[PDB]
Design an enzyme around this catalytic site. Structure first.
Site, PDB file in Angstrom:
ATOM      1  N   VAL A   1      84.712  17.811  11.041  1.00 58.93           N
ATOM      2  CA  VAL A   1      84.133  18.662  12.029  1.00 58.93           C
ATOM      3  C   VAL A   1      85.904  19.930  12.191  1.00 58.93           C
ATOM      4  CG1 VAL A   1      82.992  20.081  13.858  1.00 58.93           C
ATOM      5  CG2 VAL A   1      82.424  18.088  12.542  1.00 58.93           C
TER       6      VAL A   1
ATOM      7  N   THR B 248      85.199  12.189  16.189  1.00 57.18           N
ATOM      8  CA  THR B 248      84.324  11.411  16.728  1.00 57.18           C
ATOM      9  C   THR B 248      83.161  12.616  16.244  1.00 57.18           C
ATOM     10  OG1 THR B 248      85.944  11.618  18.701  1.00 57.18           O
ATOM     11  CG2 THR B 248      83.431  12.562  19.360  1.00 57.18           C
TER      12      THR B 248
ATOM     13  N   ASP C 248      70.764  11.904  18.451  1.00 61.57           N
ATOM     14  CA  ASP C 248      71.912  11.502  19.043  1.00 61.57           C
ATOM     15  C   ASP C 248      73.036  12.083  20.514  1.00 61.57           C
ATOM     16  OD1 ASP C 248      74.066  10.408  18.573  1.00 61.57           O
ATOM     17  OD2 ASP C 248      75.180  11.428  17.206  1.00 61.57           O
TER      18      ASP C 248
HETATM   19  N1  LIG Z   1      80.738  23.700  18.626  1.00 61.67           N
HETATM   20  C1  LIG Z   1      81.451  23.054  18.785  1.00 61.67           C
HETATM   21  N2  LIG Z   1      82.399  22.767  19.375  1.00 61.67           N
HETATM   22  C2  LIG Z   1      83.417  23.148  19.492  1.00 61.67           C
HETATM   23  N3  LIG Z   1      83.834  21.015  18.845  1.00 61.67           N
HETATM   24  C3  LIG Z   1      82.608  21.003  18.701  1.00 61.67           C
HETATM   25  C4  LIG Z   1      82.799  19.417  18.777  1.00 61.67           C
HETATM   26  C5  LIG Z   1      81.754  18.675  17.381  1.00 61.67           C
HETATM   27  C6  LIG Z   1      80.861  19.223  16.968  1.00 61.67           C
HETATM   28  C7  LIG Z   1      79.437  19.356  16.093  1.00 61.67           C
HETATM   29  C8  LIG Z   1      79.939  18.073  16.195  1.00 61.67           C
HETATM   30  C9  LIG Z   1      78.501  17.138  15.293  1.00 61.67           C
HETATM   31  N4  LIG Z   1      77.942  18.130  14.550  1.00 61.67           N
HETATM   32  C10 LIG Z   1      77.617  18.951  15.085  1.00 61.67           C
HETATM   33  F1  LIG Z   1      77.292  20.143  14.090  1.00 61.67           F
HETATM   34  C11 LIG Z   1      79.065  20.184  15.793  1.00 61.67           C
HETATM   35  N5  LIG Z   1      80.872  20.906  17.087  1.00 61.67           N
HETATM   36  C12 LIG Z   1      81.208  21.752  18.183  1.00 61.67           C
END
Ligand SMILES: Nc1ncnc2ccc(-c3ccnc(F)c3)nc12
Ligand SMILES: [Mg+2]
EC number: 2.7.11.1
Length: 285
Positions: free
Chosen positions: A27, A23, A137
């Site tokens: 990450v 997704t 986004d």
């Molecule tokens: N902070 C988060 N805690 C848990 N699940 C996550 C999933 C995606 C992102 C995410 C997606 C895209 N760019 C990012 F900087 C972080 N951050 C997190």
């Protein structure tokens, strides 16, 4: 920031597993070695093609994350190998808004839950917009929940790229066509996205979900504003969606104006909603 002076993450942070299986791309659910506290870690390769784009995601997340509705920046690290950049931030352990709606009975959220979540999105957006930052986004996948039902915004990756993401939450003005070659837009494009996110919470999917993404891309700039399918919703909820989904961004309200919208402004069951959301998070865990 400077990529040269960054330290190696060995013995400071470690990767546990990928979050959202693609997704968000590279990450991870990470862990602060010494304390065991979770962190989300965005792993990007320091290639010459994507080196300035990489630095900009650090700088933006660093300065604009000191707000309760935006996941907080912890630090940046480089794991030398093609070098790997680790971008460490606050971990939100209760998944995204999309996950919340798909893991609910009938793929629909209670109206007062939508009001609570939409306000937290708009408060996070108001913080970005006042600092002359457009998120770009906004979608249910970029809106995360913590264990205690707190709502936080993520992803400064396309904030104002080689791969165009999902088009369903994109405002008409961001899609270039014959009368819009420069795809000219402002902070109000996030408000359209917020409106699509509220439909997504109400129906379990954004409008045009059943179309090929390329077909939705063609349809967004020409279709009238999307509408909620069901007639069950309150007048205030229909009015809120209409506010977010003004076709022409030039007469779309500001984040400040939408925060004063009765649907967002008047939340008497706020306390109970937080308890219900917490309960839903615990019953899914
Ligand atoms: N902070 C988060 N805690 C848990 N699940 C996550 C999933 C995606 C992102 C995410 C997606 C895209 N760019 C990012 F900087 C972080 N951050 C997190
Ligand atoms: Mg924060």
């Amino acid at each position: 920031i400077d990529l040269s002076s960054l330290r190696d993450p060995a013995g400071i942070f470690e990767l546990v597993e990928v979050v959202g299986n693609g997704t968000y791309g590279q990450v991870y659910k990470g862990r602060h070695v010494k304390t065991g506290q979770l962190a989300a870690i965005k792993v990007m390769d320091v290639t010459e093609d994507e080196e300035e784009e990489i630095k900009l995601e650090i700088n933006m997340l660093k300065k604009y994350s000191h707000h309760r509705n935006i996941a907080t920046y912890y630090g940046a690290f480089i794991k030398k190998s093609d070098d790997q950049l680790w971008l460490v931030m606050e971990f939100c352990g209760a998944g995204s808004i999309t996950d919340l709606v798909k893991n609910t009975k009938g793929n629909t959220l209670k109206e007062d839950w939508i009001a609570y979540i939409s306000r937290e999105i708009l408060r996070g957006l108001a913080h970005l917009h006042i600092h002359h930052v457009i998120h770009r986004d906004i979608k249910g996948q970029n809106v995360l929940l913590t264990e205690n039902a707190e709502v936080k915004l993520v992803d400064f990756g396309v904030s104002a790229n080689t791969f165009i993401g999902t088009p369903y939450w994109m405002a008409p003005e961001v899609i270039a066509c014959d009368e819009n070659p420069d795809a000219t837009y402002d902070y109000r494009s996030d408000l359209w996205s917020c409106g699509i996110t509220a439909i997504e919470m109400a129906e379990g999917a954004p409008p045009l979900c059943d179309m090929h993404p390329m077909r939705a891309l063609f349809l967004i700039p020409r279709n009238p504003p999307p509408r909620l399918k069901s007639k069950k919703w309150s007048k205030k909820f229909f009015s809120f969606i209409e506010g977010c989904l003004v076709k022409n961004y030039m007469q779309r309200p500001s984040t400040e104006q939408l925060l004063k919208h009765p649907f967002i402004r008047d939340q008497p069951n706020e306390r109970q909603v937080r308890i219900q959301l917490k309960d839903h998070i615990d019953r899914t865990r």
